[PDB]
Amino acid sequence: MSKFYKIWLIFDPRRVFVAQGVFLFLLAAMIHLVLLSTEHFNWFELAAANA
Amino acid sequence: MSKFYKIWLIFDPRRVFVAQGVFLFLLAAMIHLVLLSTEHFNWFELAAANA
Amino acid sequence: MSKFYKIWLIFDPRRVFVAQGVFLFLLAAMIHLVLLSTEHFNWFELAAANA
Amino acid sequence: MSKFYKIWLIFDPRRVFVAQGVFLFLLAAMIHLVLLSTEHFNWFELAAANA
Amino acid sequence: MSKFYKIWLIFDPRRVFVAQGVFLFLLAAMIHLVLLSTEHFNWFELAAANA
Amino acid sequence: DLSFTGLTDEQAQELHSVYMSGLWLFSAVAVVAHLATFIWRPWF
Amino acid sequence: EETFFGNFDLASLSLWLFYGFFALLIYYLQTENMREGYPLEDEDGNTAANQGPFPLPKEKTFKLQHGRGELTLPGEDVQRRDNLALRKTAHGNGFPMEPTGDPMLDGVGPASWSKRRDVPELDAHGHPKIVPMSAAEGFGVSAGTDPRGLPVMAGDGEIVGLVSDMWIDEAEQLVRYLELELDPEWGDGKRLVQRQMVRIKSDRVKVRSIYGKHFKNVPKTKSPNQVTLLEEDKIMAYYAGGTLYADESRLEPQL
Amino acid sequence: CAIGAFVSWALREVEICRKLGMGYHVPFAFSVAIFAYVTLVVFRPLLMGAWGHGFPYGIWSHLDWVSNTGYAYLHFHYNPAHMLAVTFFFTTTLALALHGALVLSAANPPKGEEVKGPDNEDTFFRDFIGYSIGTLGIHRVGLLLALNAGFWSAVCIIISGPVWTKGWPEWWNWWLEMPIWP
Amino acid sequence: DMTCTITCWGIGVLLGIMTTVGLMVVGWSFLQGAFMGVLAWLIVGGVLAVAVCGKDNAEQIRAEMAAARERVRGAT
Amino acid sequence: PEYQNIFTQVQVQGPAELGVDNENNLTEERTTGTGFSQLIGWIGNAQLGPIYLGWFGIISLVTGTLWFNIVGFNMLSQVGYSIPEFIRQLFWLALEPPSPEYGLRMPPLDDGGWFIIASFFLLVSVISWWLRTYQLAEMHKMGKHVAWAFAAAIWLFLVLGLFRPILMGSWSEAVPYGIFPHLDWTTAFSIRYGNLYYNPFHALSIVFLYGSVLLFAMHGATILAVTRFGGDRELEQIYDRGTASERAGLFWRWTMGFNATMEGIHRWAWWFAVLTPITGGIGILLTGTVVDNWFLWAVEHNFAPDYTQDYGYEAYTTYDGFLGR
Amino acid sequence: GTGMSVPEFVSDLDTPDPTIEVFLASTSDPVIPEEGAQTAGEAYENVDPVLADLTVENYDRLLAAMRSWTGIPDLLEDPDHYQSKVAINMIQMNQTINEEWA
Amino acid sequence: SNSLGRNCVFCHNSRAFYDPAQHTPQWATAMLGISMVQELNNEWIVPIGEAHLPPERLGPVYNDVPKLACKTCHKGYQQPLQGLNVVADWPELATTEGPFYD
Ligand code: BCL
Ligand SMILES: CC[C@H]1c2cc3[nH]c4c(c3C)C(=O)[C@H](C(=O)OC)c4c3nc(cc4[nH]c(cc(n2)[C@@H]1C)c(C(C)=O)c4C)[C@@H](C)[C@@H]3CCC(=O)OC/C=C(/C)CCC[C@H](C)CCC[C@H](C)CCCC(C)C
Ligand SMILES: CC[C@H]1c2cc3[nH]c4c(c3C)C(=O)[C@H](C(=O)OC)c4c3nc(cc4[nH]c(cc(n2)[C@@H]1C)c(C(C)=O)c4C)[C@@H](C)[C@@H]3CCC(=O)OC/C=C(\C)CCC[C@H](C)CCC[C@H](C)CCCC(C)C
Ligand SMILES: CC[C@H]1c2cc3[nH]c4c(c3C)C(=O)[C@H](C(=O)OC)c4c3nc(cc4[nH]c(cc(n2)[C@@H]1C)c(C(C)=O)c4C)[C@@H](C)[C@@H]3CCC(=O)OC/C=C(\C)CCC[C@H](C)CCC[C@H](C)CCCC(C)C
Ligand SMILES: COC1=C(OC)C(=O)C(C/C=C(\C)CC/C=C(\C)CC/C=C(\C)CC/C=C(\C)CC/C=C(\C)CC/C=C(\C)CC/C=C(/C)CC/C=C(\C)CC/C=C(\C)CCC=C(C)C)=C(C)C1=O
Ligand SMILES: CCCCCCCC/C=C\CCCCCCCC(=O)O[C@H](COC(=O)CCCCCCCCCCCCCCCCC)COP(=O)(O)OC[C@@H](O)CO
Ligand SMILES: CCCCCCCC/C=C\CCCCCCCC(=O)O[C@H](COC(=O)CCCCCCCCCCCCCCCCC)COP(=O)(O)OC[C@@H](O)CO
Ligand SMILES: CCCCCCCC/C=C\CCCCCCCC(=O)O[C@H](COC(=O)CCCCCCCCCCCCCCCCC)COP(=O)(O)OC[C@@H](O)CO
Ligand SMILES: CCCCCCCC/C=C\CCCCCCCC(=O)O[C@H](COC(=O)CCCCCCCCCCCCCCCCC)COP(=O)(O)OC[C@@H](O)CO
Ligand SMILES: COC(C)(C)C(=O)C/C=C(\C)CC/C=C(\C)CC/C=C(\C)CCCC/C(C)=C/CCC(C)CC/C=C(/C)CCC=C(C)C
Ligand SMILES: COC(C)(C)C(=O)C/C=C(\C)CC/C=C(\C)CC/C=C(\C)CCCC/C(C)=C\CCC(C)CC/C=C(\C)CCC=C(C)C
Ligand SMILES: [Fe+3]
């Protein structure tokens, strides 16, 4: 370590920054939708059932 | 945190402004429709069933 | 909040005005149609119901 | 509000007038047809049934 | 042989790293999904069963 | 695209060394994850 | 509806009439396509005994533009080559021929050119059709990557020079040729490459057909502002012949 | 034997192209027609589980096969990928007719007149319809249209058997019961 | 800048795939969700290739070009 | 690999072309104003416009828009002026031809009168577009090949809509104006008169359609392979033979034993394409008027196959065995 | 070579009609009449079509069957409800279907 | 076709829809079923319902009495209940005359 900063001498800051944002949002949306497709982890149905 | 202002030395403000506006509006519309697709959080049916 | 006037140092006013003019009417039409697809807030059917 | 005349320093009068005419006629035709599509406000059918 | 650094002179780091990253992510996601396809190791169904 | 047109000798030793530093870090993390998973739900 | 005789009715009559018409049409179509390359010859240049089942068509005349004259076909072959450095590999007919010297320099095989007119092609106003971009009023690169200033790499991996200009067809608004200035080590002067034989990338321009050592023998235009049809044919055929003659492994079976 | 003959024909065309120093577009185009035939006698039959699903070798008996195979899905005109394929076929024929007519009319003027050039051809078509593809674009477009016609034909047949079992009109139900409709 | 256009079309393809899976979780069938996914792709990806890729880079160059268009008019 | 010439590498743009002229003064009726599209320019030309406006084109446009609006407004009124239902059932609606009981007389507007008024406006529109195609060649001093090729398709158009109904004695024989309804007409027409496969002119039309598509694959591919020798400049190759024409001819000569010329291949293409609607119209004109059952005609003329095996699923399997029970 | 065949998915061929099992859970074997058995008309006041039936056959036909096959729990209890009047005709129609349309 | 879950080449050879020599044996039983349906609608189903059925069973337009067709009994299957023997246990619904318990 202490030499990971040299990653920016090979990869372009602008290409890495757009790709990472797209990947991060897509992964977050996918995980939230996977949770929404279950029974034990769907909070919208949990709210209705509780009350 | 005190040096995040340099993000505008890599990203063109016009492009990010347009993309952020589109992204924010689409996210708001999707969330509102997801709320409309349920039973406990549909405010158009609650008004019908509370009058 | 007193420096928002600089938005026109970045955006072309003509493009922004055209886009906003399209967007506002499209959104208003969408909401006016969403109201008509329900039972409680459809003013065309309500008038016949109370006649 | 006393300075709304400055819109003409942004948009060419010729184009805006043509679009306004087309938009107004299409909107009026759509509204008249929407009224014709109902039972309560169809004045031809009302005249037929009132005699 | 004692130092295998002599393998990057016949390669270009850029594409090697890109392919590595894609391969790693795809293999991890496929293992996670394969585990999710199994009765005994599906941790989302286990929470519903331990309820 | 090749503008580097070949690496040198001393521009590769440092690379190997940094690459090896990440590979060992990723593997230590994976080993701990696998150990915890085996403690939770064994498969052997 | 009734029949004329037996089972013959109106549909049968129509079908047989179409049969006859189609036979005549096939004859006309095959005869119309024999205005070039006939009569047939053998492998020694003499007229062949067999000439086929269809006779030759009568003559048509074309009135050309810009005072170029008239063209009557079928007629004599005016695009014929005179002294070809070729050798028979057999005593009869049906076997290939062998080049006597350098196939690429002698214009034989896939490097063959046809003896076209020694004048440039004209547009509607009577002006040369293909013009270098440095003399074309109003033209600019509107899309894609501009190749001017990039180095050129040959098929064996050698840099031979730089792109200096582009030659465009103004009537159709299309790039036709790229102009290359050679380094002193690989020759002297300027050469042309047709657009269909290059791949333009971000840092280079690739020509795979020929190698570096072949770049000095590309035919050269007489005037720096216009190119005739004969020169066009000789330049394009030279690059086309390299796909087979650049390396000895390109000519042998690939297996 | 037919598969072997077709593949050998394509590989012979490849060698002729190599000897003449030309591009390899013609064998690539012929490969599409080979793919539509191998789908009809090898791919659909293997997927469906029996060689008896292929069409017979007869001038008037291979039309009976076509007729019976289409009525086995009730109304074949309603197959979505068959509609795309028919459109491609008709468009290729309209474009071939236009191209041949334009070239012949440029090369054969009225008696006593001079011949015409590409400028005249570009002008006639912008006057007629307001656009001209050009002398190079028309060949690209014709090739692309023909290859798209053969690819979509292969798709229309391979979904009719192994992917869909009911009538093709019923497939449109997804549009008729979309939740947006009142 | 044909490379920004292709990127923008790919973000549209990705939004379309996400629209299909989202409508299916809410109760729609595949083909119903995929028609809506195709329109999200074509409308949004097209809109972003005009707007984002049309905010081309130029900085004082943008300024002068615009201040000179504002001189064409005035005498037009 | 080598460049293949399907997409242009770099585009160049200059002043817009306004067109050639002669003593006929075509400039007076041409619109001013052009555009450029870089998306299209990857494949072909990028310039858009201008267009010529004569009287034939204006009349054709006006009368064709009238036909479209009579059909569209009839379709809209059939549904109760409900726009969302109008959109839902767009592919299913149509403007229906008259009932068979009325013969060739004028039917009630509710039962085919609007269909006849709209058919008269479409007729006028189509014949006007053809007079424009003839006039422009005459004005451009070119041959009339385009007009003849268009009249070839107009022949089948008129046979389907005008000639056959008159010879049969009913306006009810015409085709409805709809997407699905017109495809139902095709299937019902084939069923009503036996099997249309056994109509010989239908087979000839299929032969020529298949041949026309095989020829654009061959001609397009051949021209794209000789573009490295200037082969897309066809007219100058006709006026002065070059090596591109020689190589293109020799490829097919060595492949299948005969070849064409640069000028003569376009005659082949023109004839195969033109022959499809001519044979199709001759085949359609003979149905009902002469032959009423094409399969019985084939049996009479001895080209109908015969089968030896039996009919029925229980001649080959069992209902329980097909279910796995 | 004809193209005459009918296609089906094998997951669909292995799924039986789901009402076959409902039937088998509502059916019973007939009871053979004995010597001089007492009929339904000598035990209640019924209708002619169902009167010369025995008591046990009356029991299985009426309740165990007709009231479960048509989900009408009180069928044929009030002789004046319209459902009884239509069921009496349906019995004869069901008999004629089996007898004359074999 | 949609009522039996089959297609056109079931009962037909599509090159000649008219020819009796190219039909399958199922065509004849379908022809019998046409007449059976026509008789059941006109003689049994319509007459009762015009005399007893309540106003809420009379359909949108014309105040029609509901009718039956081929799918009322097959339900998208080749045979009703895929061929279950449902008449062996109920001899009382098998004949118009006295129930034969032999
Ligand atoms: C159940 C279906 C029947 C069947 C029933 C029919 C019927 C019925 C017909 C065809 C016809 C044809 N059939 Mg068939 N056909 C069947 C099976 C097949 C099969 C197959 C199984 O593979 C094939 C390949 C074909 C193919 C063909 C074509 C060869 C032929 C159409 C010729 C033509 O020029 O079309 C191209 C179409 C035209 C030229 C139409 C003319 C268009 C006009 C000129 C348009 C004017 C402009 C317009 C109004 C303006 C629009 C707006 C603009 C944007 C401004 N059939 C089966 C047996 N077939 C036709 C024929 O000729 O029969 C012999 C015909 O009528
Ligand atoms: C079978 C071939 C079909 C055809 C094709 C066709 N016509 C065309 C085009 C094409 C491909 C055009 O691109 C061009 C056009 O610009 O259409 C909007 C056009 C055209 N065909 C027309 C007429 C026409 N075509 C007809 C027929 C047909 N043309 C067939 C349907 C007919 C009839 C009834 O037979 C008519 C009357 C006009 C609608 C139009 C004439 C072009 C014109 O007047 O251009 C003026 C120039 C402009 C400034 C307008 C361009 C729009 C933009 C503001 C320019 C910037 C370009 C932008 C980047 C992209 C947008 C362009 C898109 C088309 C991609
Ligand atoms: C976009 C795809 C289109 C296409 C493309 C295409 N086909 C091509 C080419 C191209 C580009 C050629 O270059 C090549 C050629 O050389 O053309 C002259 C060819 C060709 N496509 C041909 C025909 C053809 N193409 C057709 C269609 C199409 N081909 C499409 C429309 C059709 C039909 C049915 O529509 C036919 C009939 C050939 C004329 C030709 C070259 C094929 C050839 O000669 O193959 C060598 C084989 C023999 C000489 C004989 C083989 C004998 C067999 C062993 C026995 C016969 C068995 C057979 C299956 C019986 C069928 C009976 C029928 C009655 C059903
Ligand atoms: C040889 C037979 C083949 C053939 C050839 C052929 N077709 C031809 C020609 C030729 C040689 C022409 O010259 C002519 C032409 O103009 O071609 C560009 C044409 C033509 N063939 C056409 C259609 C056509 N041809 C077909 C078939 C075929 N034509 C065969 C494959 C088919 C079918 C069913 O397969 C169709 C659908 C037209 C594009 C054109 C005839 C133009 C014509 O007569 O137009 C009348 C115009 C109106 C209806 C008035 C306009 C009203 C419109 C409803 C709206 C406004 C116009 C607008 C431009 C369209 C909408 C777009 C919007 C975005 C604005
Ligand atoms: C602008 O550009 C262009 C051109 O140009 C300028 C062109 O032109 C064309 C071409 C287009 C046309 C000319 C238009 C017309 C074309 C069509 C309509 C296409 C349709 C074509 C046909 C219907 C006919 C095609 C014929 C075919 C496919 C079969 C022909 C093949 C044979 C007869 C046999 C092949 C021979 C082989 C393989 C070699 C022999 C094999 C051996 C082992 C040799 C050993 C010797 C023997 C066995 C004994 C003798 C053998 C003999 C005599 C051979 C014959 C065989 C027999 C069995 C007798 C295009 C598109 C073009 O865009
Ligand atoms: C310069 C060179 C010229 C070359 C060009 C010549 C082309 C045309 C020339 C001649 C064709 C003559 C062939 C005629 C043979 C059949 C006879 C016939 O047409 O018979 C019909 C029966 O209809 C059919 O059998 C349907 C025909 C389908 C259409 C074409 C099929 C090609 C499909 C596929 C191609 C495969 C084989 C191809 C082979 C080419 C075959 C034409 C009725 O009989 P009739 O005589 O009308 O009845 C009255 C009588 O009974 C009185 O009593
Ligand atoms: C009955 C006989 C054929 C055997 C039966 C089975 C195959 C049937 C299918 C197709 C036949 C195509 C056979 C073509 C083979 C040609 C071989 C060849 O190469 O023959 C040349 C002579 O040929 C030619 O010059 C071209 C002939 C026309 C090509 C076929 C046209 C297909 C048109 C339309 C489609 C056809 C469908 C029918 C529409 C029915 C319509 C009622 C010798 O050399 P040449 O140097 O060119 O001599 C000439 C000159 O130069 C003198 O000097
Ligand atoms: C290898 C295995 C073969 C595969 C086995 C499969 C069987 C079927 C395949 C192919 C059959 C075609 C065979 C014929 C090819 C002959 C070879 C050839 O052509 O050999 C030439 C010799 O010429 C000839 O032998 C002339 C052939 C005449 C063609 C007839 C024309 C119309 C014909 C058709 C019209 C169609 C209309 C409708 C039709 C119905 C109506 C016909 C050498 O030429 P050359 O020495 O250069 O010069 C001389 C030159 O000019 C002319 O003499
Ligand atoms: C209904 C369709 C029937 C089937 C298709 C055949 C008919 C279609 C038309 C033509 C076919 C090709 C035949 C003609 C061309 C052959 C080449 C030829 O004539 O070669 C000559 C030698 O021949 C002759 O001297 C003529 C004698 C021909 C006799 C054979 C007849 C074949 C008859 C039939 C085929 C095989 C039968 C054997 C099997 C049984 C059936 C299964 C060499 O001299 P040359 O150098 O060419 O002369 C120079 C000249 O050209 C100057 O201009
Ligand atoms: C059960 O069946 C299925 C199919 C499901 C399976 O599961 C099958 C599974 C297998 C067959 C699995 C096989 C798995 C492997 C072979 C895995 C191999 C994995 C690797 C080799 C991974 C390598 C990862 C590399 C990483 C993370 C590198 C990191 C490097 C760095 C952070 C350093 C680089 C950065 C810098 C600064 C370089 C310095 C730069 C300079 C300029 C000096
Ligand atoms: C309401 O919304 C608006 C305003 C936007 C609209 O206008 C909407 C419009 C639509 C949605 C329109 C939709 C239109 C269609 C789907 C049209 C489809 C049309 C066809 C498929 C037409 C086929 C026509 C013809 C055919 C197949 C063959 C032959 C026809 C003819 C030769 C017709 C010519 C008729 C003659 C010569 C008879 C005239 C009678 C005399 C007495 C002279
Ligand atoms: Fe061409």
Best of G19, G21, G50 for a ligand 8 pocket test (most atoms within 8 Å of beta carbon) = G50
**Strands G151-153 vs G205-206: parallel, antiparallel or unpaired:** parallel
Residue numbers belonging to the annotated binding site of L for heme c: 8, 12, 26-27, 57, 74, 78-79
The alpha-helical segments, DSSP class H, found in chain E are 13-36, 43-49
Residues J118, J119, J123, CA angle at the centre, nearest 5°? 120
Chain J residues lying within 8 Å of K14, measured CB to CB:
324
**H or E element that contains J323:** helix J319-323
User: Are residues H29 and J217 in contact, defined by beta-carbon separation less than 8 angstroms?
Assistant: yes
Question: Which residues in G29-114 belong to E strands, given as ranges?
Answer: 60-63, 70-73, 86-88, 97-99
Instruction: Note whether K6 contacts L7, CB cutoff 8 Å.
Output: yes
- Quick one: which of G115, G105, G97 has its CA closest to G245? G105
User: Are residues L94 and K95 in contact, defined by beta-carbon separation less than 8 angstroms?
Assistant: yes
User: Are residues J97 and J175 in contact, defined by beta-carbon separation less than 8 angstroms?
Assistant: yes
Q: Whose CA is nearest to atom 29 of ligand 5?
A: J256
User: Are residues G129 and G171 in contact, defined by beta-carbon separation less than 8 angstroms?
Assistant: yes
The alpha-helical segments, DSSP class H, found in J105-260 are 113-140, 145-158, 164-168, 181-192, 200-225, 234-239, 243-256
CA distance G206 to G153: 5
- How many Cβ atoms from other residues are within 10 Å of residue I54's Cβ? 15
- Quick one: which of K97, K57, K56, K58 has its CA closest to L95? K97
Residue J95 DSSP SS3:
strand
Q: How many CB pairs under 8 A join A and F?
A: 11
Chains in contact with E, where contact requires at least 3 CB pairs less than 8 Å apart: A, F
CA distance J240 to J225: 20
C-alpha H130 to ligand 2 mean position (Å): 6
Residues in contact with D44: Cβ distance below 8 Å, sequence separation at least 6, in sequence order: D36
Which of I32, I35, I36, I39 to mutate against chain H (most H CBs within 10 Å)? I32
Residue numbers belonging to the annotated binding site of L for heme: 8, 11-12, 70, 73-74
User: Are residues K33 and L101 in contact, defined by beta-carbon separation less than 8 angstroms?
Assistant: yes
**H or E element that contains J177:** strand J177-178
How many whole angstroms from its chain centre is CA C17? 14
Residue numbers belonging to the annotated binding site of H for Fe(3+): 99, 139
User: Are residues H145 and J48 in contact, defined by beta-carbon separation less than 8 angstroms?
Assistant: no
C-alpha E12 to ligand 10 mean position (Å): 16
CA distance H95 to J270: 10
I18 in contact with A at a CB cutoff of 8 Å? yes
Which of J296, J311, J319 to mutate against chain L (most L CBs within 10 Å)? J311
Any idea what DSSP says for residue G204? -
Q: Which amino acid is at J192?
A: R
Instruction: Note whether I48 contacts B15, CB cutoff 8 Å.
Output: no
Q: Which two three-digit tokens encode residue H167?
A: 């009538």
CA distance B39 to B43: 9
User: Are residues L54 and K86 in contact, defined by beta-carbon separation less than 8 angstroms?
Assistant: no
- How many Cβ atoms from other residues are within 10 Å of residue B8's Cβ? 10
C-alpha H86 to ligand 11 mean position (Å): 20
CA distance J265 to G36: 13
CA distance J212 to J79: 42
CA distance J157 to J126: 10
Q: Whose CA is nearest to atom 47 of ligand 1?
A: J126
Residue in chain D closest to C47 (alpha carbons) equals: D40
Q: How far is CA K44 from CA K39, K53, K77, in A?
A: 9, 12, 11
Residues β-bridged to residue H139: none
CA distance E32 to F33: 13
- If you write DSSP's letter for every residue of chain G in order, what string do you get? ---SBTTB-HHHHHHHHHHHHHHHHHHHHHHHT-SSS-S-B-TTSSBPS---SSPPP--EEEE-STT--EEEES---SS--S---EEESSSSSS--EEESS-HHHHT-GGG------SSPPB-TTSSBSEEEGGG-TT-EEEEE---TT-EEE-TTS-EEEEEEEEEEETTTTEEEEEEEEEPGGG-SSEEEEEGGG-EE-SS-EE--SS-GGGGGGS---SSSS---HHHHHHHHHHHHHHHHHSSHHHHS---
Q: Which two three-digit tokens encode residue G171?
A: 């009537």
Q: Which amino acid is at C51?
A: A
Residue G115 DSSP SS3:
coil
Q: Which two three-digit tokens encode residue J202?
A: 């239908």
Q: How far is CA H92 from CA H85, H136, H139, J30, J269, in A?
A: 11, 16, 11, 30, 11
Residues G115, G118, G122, CA angle at the centre, nearest 5°? 120
Residues β-bridged to residue G130: G169
* Structure resolution, Å: 2.5
H179 in contact with I at a CB cutoff of 8 Å? yes
CA distance J1 to I59: 40
Any idea what DSSP says for residue J159? I
CA distance H145 to H90: 10
Q: Whose CA is nearest to atom 61 of ligand 1?
A: J280
**Strands G174-182 vs J94-95: parallel, antiparallel or unpaired:** unpaired
Which of H11, H114, H123, H140 to mutate against chain G (most G CBs within 10 Å)? H114
Nearest to G11 among J5, J229, J290 (CB): J290
User: Are residues H21 and G244 in contact, defined by beta-carbon separation less than 8 angstroms?
Assistant: yes
CA distance B49 to K2: 62
Best of J66, J68, J102 for a ligand 11 pocket test (most atoms within 8 Å of beta carbon) = J68
- Phi, psi (rounded to 5 degrees) for G167: -105, 125
H147 by Cβ neighbours in 10 Å (0-12 / 13-18 / 19+) ranks as: buried
The alpha-helical segments, DSSP class H, found in chain H are 2-20, 25-38, 44-48, 62-70, 80-107, 118-129, 137-160, 173-176
Q: Min CA distance, A1 vs chain I (Å)?
A: 33
Chain L residues lying within 8 Å of J295, measured CB to CB:
15-16
| Contact B/K (≥3 CB pairs under 8 Å) | no
Instruction: State yes or no: D28 annotated in a binding site.
Output: yes
Interface of A with I in 32-51 (CB under 8 A): 33, 36-37
Residues β-bridged to residue G193: G178
Instruction: Note whether J45 contacts G14, CB cutoff 8 Å.
Output: no
Residue G19 CB less than 6 A away from ligand 7: yes
Angle at which helices I30-51 and I3-26 cross, to 10°: 150
Chains in contact with J, where contact requires at least 3 CB pairs less than 8 Å apart: D, G, H, K, L
Q: Whose CA is nearest to atom 25 of ligand 3?
A: J214
How many whole angstroms from its chain centre is CA J90? 23
Q: Which two three-digit tokens encode residue J49?
A: 């416009």
Residue G50 CB less than 6 A away from ligand 9: yes
Interface of J with G in 266-305 (CB under 8 A): 267-268, 271, 279, 282, 286, 289-291, 297, 300-301
Residue E10 DSSP SS3:
coil
Nearest to H68 among L1, L2, L9 (CB): L9
Residue H93 CB less than 6 A away from ligand 4: yes
Q: Which two three-digit tokens encode residue H169?
A: 């009109």
C-alpha J266 to ligand 9 mean position (Å): 30
- Quick one: which of G113, G109, G110, G114 has its CA closest to G77? G114
C-alpha H90 to ligand 1 mean position (Å): 9
H132 by Cβ neighbours in 10 Å (0-12 / 13-18 / 19+) ranks as: buried
Chains in contact with I, where contact requires at least 3 CB pairs less than 8 Å apart: A, B, H
- Quick one: which of I56, E33, K4, H14 has its CA closest to L6? K4
CA distance G38 to C23: 70
Q: Which amino acid is at J25?
A: N
CA distance G170 to G179: 17
Instruction: Note whether D40 contacts C48, CB cutoff 8 Å.
Output: yes
CA distance G15 to J286: 11
Q: Which two three-digit tokens encode residue H44?
A: 């659909």
